[PDB]
Amino acid sequence: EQGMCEEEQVARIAWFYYHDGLTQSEISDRLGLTRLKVSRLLEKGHQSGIIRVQINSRFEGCLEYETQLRRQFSLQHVRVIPGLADADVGGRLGIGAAHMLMSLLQPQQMLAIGFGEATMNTLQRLSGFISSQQIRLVTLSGGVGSYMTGIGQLNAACSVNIIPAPLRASSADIARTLKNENCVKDVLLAAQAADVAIVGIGAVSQQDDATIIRSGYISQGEQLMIGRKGAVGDILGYFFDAKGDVVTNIKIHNELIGLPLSALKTIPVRVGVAGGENKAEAIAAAMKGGYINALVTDQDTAAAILRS
Amino acid sequence: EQGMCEEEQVARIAWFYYHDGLTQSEISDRLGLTRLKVSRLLEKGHQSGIIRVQINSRFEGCLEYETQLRRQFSLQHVRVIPGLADADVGGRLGIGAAHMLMSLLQPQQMLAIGFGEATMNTLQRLSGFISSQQIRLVTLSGGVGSYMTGIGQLNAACSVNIIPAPLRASSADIARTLKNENCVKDVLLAAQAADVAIVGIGAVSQQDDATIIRSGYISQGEQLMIGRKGAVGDILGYFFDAKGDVVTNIKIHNELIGLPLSALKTIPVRVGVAGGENKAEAIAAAMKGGYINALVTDQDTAAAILRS
Amino acid sequence: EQGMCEEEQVARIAWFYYHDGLTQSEISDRLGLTRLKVSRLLEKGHQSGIIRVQINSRFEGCLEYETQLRRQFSLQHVRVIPGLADADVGGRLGIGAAHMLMSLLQPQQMLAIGFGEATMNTLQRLSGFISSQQIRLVTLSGGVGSYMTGIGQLNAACSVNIIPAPLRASSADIARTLKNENCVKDVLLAAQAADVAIVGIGAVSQQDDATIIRSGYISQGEQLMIGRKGAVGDILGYFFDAKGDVVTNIKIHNELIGLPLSALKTIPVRVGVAGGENKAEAIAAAMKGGYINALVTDQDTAAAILRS
Amino acid sequence: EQGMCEEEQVARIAWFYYHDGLTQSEISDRLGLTRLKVSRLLEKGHQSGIIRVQINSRFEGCLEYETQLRRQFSLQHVRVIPGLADADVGGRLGIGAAHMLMSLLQPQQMLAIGFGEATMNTLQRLSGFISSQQIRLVTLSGGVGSYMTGIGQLNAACSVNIIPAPLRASSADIARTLKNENCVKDVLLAAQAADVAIVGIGAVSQQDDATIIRSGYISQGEQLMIGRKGAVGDILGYFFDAKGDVVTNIKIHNELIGLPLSALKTIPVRVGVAGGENKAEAIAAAMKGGYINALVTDQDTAAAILRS
Numbered sequence A, B, C, D: 001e002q003g004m005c006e007e008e009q010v011a012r013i014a015w016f017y018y019h020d021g022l023t024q025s026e027i028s029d030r031l032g033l034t035r036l037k038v039s040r041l042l043e044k045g046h047q048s049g050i051i052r053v054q055i056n057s058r059f060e061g062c063l064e065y066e067t068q069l070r071r072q073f074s075l076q077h078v079r080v081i082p083g084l085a086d087a088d089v090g091g092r093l094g095i096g097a098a099h100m101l102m103s104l105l106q107p108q109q110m111l112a113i114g115f116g117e118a119t120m121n122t123l124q125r126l127s128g129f130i131s132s133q134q135i136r137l138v139t140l141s142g143g144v145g146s147y148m149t150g151i152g153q154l155n156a157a158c159s160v161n162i163i164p165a166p167l168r169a170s171s172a173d174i175a176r177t178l179k180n181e182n183c184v185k186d187v188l189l190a191a192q193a194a195d196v197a198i199v200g201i202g203a204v205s206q207q208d209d210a211t212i213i214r215s216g217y218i219s220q221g222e223q224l225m226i227g228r229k230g231a232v233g234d235i236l237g238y239f240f241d242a243k244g245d246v247v248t249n250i251k252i253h254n255e256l257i258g259l260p261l262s263a264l265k266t267i268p269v270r271v272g273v274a275g276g277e278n279k280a281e282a283i284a285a286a287m288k289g290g291y292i293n294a295l296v297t298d299q300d301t302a303a304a305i306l307r308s
C-alpha cells in the first residue's frame, strides 16, 4: 500500500473521479497504482457501500406501478425497480431492498431476517450500513448454514443473534422440544421484538428452482402435495393459498423451528423482497394475508401482480 | 606444533574460524597443520567444552521448552512463544497457531475448529490463508453463535459447515435426539473426516474466568462438582483427569451435542492452542490422553507444564 | 420517449449505469434512444442534481479539508489524516509525513530535518526508505542530542551531517562566533542546499507542554514575554506572529545556532508536520509566512485552521 | 516472514546448526527460506551478537604476551589477539575489545568512549550488549560526526550523551568559551564520572594514515611540528612523548573541547584498543603515562611493545 488502507484508497479515487473528474488513467499514476488496480477499486467501492449513488427523483423506481401496488394492497413502503430480462433476480432486488432498509432503519435498531437469495443479497449490500448504524441482526428461522452467505460477508463486530437449530425437525415432537430449549426459545423472543423484518417469498410454481427445494428442506414430492392442497407460495417454510391463508393441512408447518407467521405479524415493518413473474401470485397472496406490508420487486413482477 | 600444545591450537583455530571467518584450509597453512588436522581439532574443541556456542536471545528459552515438551510428550509439532515477559501474550498465541496451521493445511483440505477465545483469535489471523488456499471449515460442536466472532471475520465465498444445534441440550435424551437429525449427523461425520483440528483447552482451576463457565454452558455449582470428581481440564465440554482420562460420572457429557473426545482423535493432526499458567495441569493432561498431538503455548505455561 | 419524460429517462439510465453496470450502449437500445442521447442525459443528470455520488467514509472529511487548505493557503502538497476519533493521532502523523516524504525524495537527495517529536517520529518510520534510497540527512539547527532518537533509529552507513554546536548559545556574540567555525558554517551551507525539509511547529498556546520549553531551551518566563510580544508559534526556535512575520524584538533569536527562517525558505520543498488543535493558530501562521509549503496534519486541527 | 521476526529466525537456525547439527541446507526447507538466506542470517547472527562463541581457555589470546605486558606495565586487564597479516586491524581489535568490555561492564553502567576505527568497531560489536545490559554512553571528546559510525549502528532506546561541539576550536579563546556553555560543561562532567573508558591511540609514525589527519582535525604540516617537538602518539587529541608526558609546547592542546588527559584518569578502568607495529611506541607511552590501565592489541604489536 501507500501508507493508506484500501478504504482510504477507494475514497481517494472516488474523489478524483467524481469530484475532480479525472480519467481512470490520470489517477493511476496520481495514487501510484496500475491502470487496472484503479478501476478494480472503483467497482470495489460501489459494491461495498463506500460509493453511494443517489437518484433524487420520484422516478427512482416505476412510479406508476408503485403508486398502484401501494393503494391496491395498502402498503407502507413499496419499491419497484426497472425491469431487465436475463439477470440475477435477487442481485438486483438486493440493491433496491438495501436502499429501502437504509431509510427505515434507525441507529441501534433490531433487524429480523429470513433466508434466500433475495434477502442474503440485501444483507450483502447492507453490510456497510449495518456496521455504522450498528444494526443488530436476528434470524427469523432455524437453518444456520442457509444464513452464512449474508452474515458471513459482514463485519465481525456486529450483533448477530442466530437460532441454534435446524430449519426443520424430523418430527413435530422434536420441533416442539427444540422450541423449548433456552438457547432457541431466547432467540425466538428476540426475533419477535424486532423493529424491521426482511423476508423472501417462495412460489409453488417455481417447481425445482425454489430455494426451499434446491436447498433440500422440502422434497420434490412433498411440493406436489402442497400445490395439490391449494398453496401458492411460502415465507420461512409456512405455505399459504391465493387468498393469504396458511393451509393448516401441511405436515411441515409443525416441524418448523422458527417464528410462525402469526408471530412475524408483531414486527412493525415487514419487507418482502421478491421478483419474477412466476412469483406474482404468491407475492400478491402474501400482501393479502398481511404477512408483509412493504415490498421490493421488479417492474415485470409488478405488472404481473396488478394484472391478475 | 609450532611450540603450541593442543589446547592452544584449538583456541587458535576457533578464533580464526569464528571471529575471523577463515576456511578450515586458510587456517591449515596459517598454523602449519594439515587441513585434516585442523578439522579434527575443531571437532575436538566442541566435544571437550573448550568451544561453546550460546544463543543470546529471549527466544532461546522457548527453543528449550520446545524440545523438552517434544521429548516428554509425544508431540508432532510444538511452538512456544515468549511469555508475559513480552506484550500481548494472548494476542500472540493466535499468531503462532495461525502459522502452525499454515504449514499443516494443504490447498482445499478440511479444518475442524473448536470454540473459545484462542481458537477464534487464531481463526481470524488465518482468514487470509483460508480464502487463498480454499480451506474448508467445520465446527466440532454445537453453539453456532460461539463461532461467529471467528468465521464472521471471514470470506463469504468459502465453505463453512456448522452444526445447527445448541452446544448443550437440557437432557441426555434431547441430546441423543438432536444427534440423530440428518442435518446434524451430517456435520458430525464431516467433522471426523477433517485433516487438521484446532481447539482450546479449559482448566478447572480457571474457576469463573473459564470460558466454558463465562459463556453460561456450565453453572458454578457444576464446575465445582466436576472439579471434585477429579477433572482438571476440558476440550469442547468434555472433562478429564490429570491422567488424561475423560471423567465418566459427569452428567453434562451426555447432554453435549458434538463429537466426543474419542472421535476427535480420528483426526490425524490435532492442534491445541492454550496459554496461561493456570492451564498448565489441564494442557498437560490433554496430551497424556492424546486429545492433541500439536501444541502452541507461551513460555511461562510450558515451564509449569514441565515443572510438575 | 417510450412514454417517459426526461426526468424518468435520466433515473432509468442512471439506475442501469450504476446499479446494473451496463455499457452506455447496452442501455441505448434497452431504452430505445440513440447512443449519443444516452450519454447526453447522463451528463445532464449530474449537472441537474438528480444524480449525486457521495463517499461514505470518515476519510471524506479529510479529503474535504485537504482541498480547503489547498485553496486557502498556497500548499504544494497536503495530507489530512483522521483526528482523535481514530486511535494514535500522534503516531499516525509520523506515518503520513513519512509517506509524503517518500513521494518527494528521489534517490541520493538531501533531506534537511528539524528536531521535535513529530519530526523524530517521522524520521523513524522513514528509516527503511532513507537507507534503500541513499538519502542524505542534515540538521537544520544545533541540539545534536535533540536528533538522536531519530537518526539513532537509522543505519550507520548512511550520510548524516550534524551541526556540532548547542541549539542556543548564552549570548548573541557566542552564537555569532560559533556560526563562524568552519566545522559549523559548513553544515549550515549544506542545509540550505537540501532538496526537501521536514520540520515541526511549536505553538505559544502549548504553554509548558511545548517541546521547545519542555526541553529547556526556553524558560517559562521567556515564553510568556514572547507571547506577550505577538508570537503565536515557532519553527526551530524562531518565533512569529499570526501574520507570519518573525517577531524582531526577541533576544533568543540572535543566540540561536542554526539557519534563520528566511534561509529555510531557499529549500524547494518545505514540509511541516504538526498535529493537535492548539497549534491551529501557529500552523496557519507558518503558512502565511511561507516557511512551509507542504503540510501533514490531523482532521480536528485542519478544521480549526480553517475556522479562524 | 513466517510469523517470526528476523531475531527469531536467526535463533532458530543457530539452534538447528549448533545444537542439532543440521546442514545449512536441511534447515533451508525446515524454516522455509532459501539456502542462501539461511547462511546470510547465520553470519548475520555472529556479526550482531545473537550468536556468541565462547573460547574457554587460558589461550584465548596470546597467554605469554599478556602475562608479560600485564606485569611489565602493571595493567588491570590485557587482551592480545592472534596475529593475522593483511587484515582490517580495527575490525579485529573491535571483536577483542568487545568481549573484554562485556565482562568489565555491570548493568546500567556508564561507558565513556573516544573516536576512531578501533573504538567504533568495538562499539558496533557491543551494540547488542549495550542494549540488554542497558549501558549508558558518553563521548570523551567533541566532534559529534566522528562518533556516528558507532552510535548510529545502535538501538534508539539507549542513553547516549554527546558533547555538542566540534573536536577542536579555531582558537584557544573559542575553546574555553565552549567548555563553559551549560550543555557542553554538563556532558564533560558526565564523562568524568564514567565507570569504564575505551579509547584509541594515534601514533606520529602513522604519517597521513592517522585517523587524526585523514579526518581533517589536524594539518599534516602541524603533524611534523609535533613530531619534531618530541611526541610519539596521542589520545583524543592530546599528544605525549616516549616517556608518557603531555608535550606542553603544542598549540592544539588549548583548542580542544573535551576532557583533558588529566581528567580522563579519574575513570576507574581505562581500556586502550590499538594495533599495528608503528603504534608499539605510542601504545607503550600511554601505559607509562598512566592514561590507560588496560589494553587490547594484537600479537605482533605485543611483541613489538615488549621488544623495544
Ligand SMILES: O=P(O)(O)OC[C@H]1O[C@H](O)[C@H](O)[C@@H]1O
Pocket: A090, A114, A115, A116, A117, A118, A119, A199, A200, A201, A202, A210, A211, A212, A234, A235, A236, A237, A273, A274
Ligand atoms: O431465494 P428467494 O427465492 O429470493 O427466497 C425464497 C425463500 O425465502 C422465502 O421467504 C421462502 O422461505 C423461500 O424458501
Ligand SMILES: O=P(O)(O)OC[C@H]1O[C@H](O)[C@H](O)[C@@H]1O
Pocket: B114, B115, B116, B117, B118, B119, B199, B200, B201, B202, B210, B211, B212, B234, B235, B236, B237, B274
Ligand atoms: O477461551 P479459551 O479458554 O481459549 O477456550 C477454552 C474453551 O474452548 C476449549 O476448546 C474448551 O472447550 C474450553 O471450554
Ligand SMILES: O=P(O)(O)OC[C@H]1O[C@H](O)[C@H](O)[C@@H]1O
Pocket: C114, C115, C116, C117, C118, C119, C199, C200, C201, C202, C210, C211, C212, C234, C235, C236, C237, C274
Ligand atoms: O515536538 P513538536 O511539538 O511536534 O515539535 C515542535 C518543536 O520542533 C519544531 O521544529 C519547533 O522548533 C518546536 O520547538
Ligand SMILES: O=P(O)(O)OC[C@H]1O[C@H](O)[C@H](O)[C@@H]1O
Pocket: D090, D114, D115, D116, D117, D118, D119, D199, D200, D201, D202, D210, D211, D212, D234, D235, D236, D237, D238, D273, D274
Ligand atoms: O582509528 P584509530 O587509529 O584506531 O584511533 C586513533 C585516534 O583515536 C586515538 O585516541 C587518537 O586520538 C587518534 O586520533
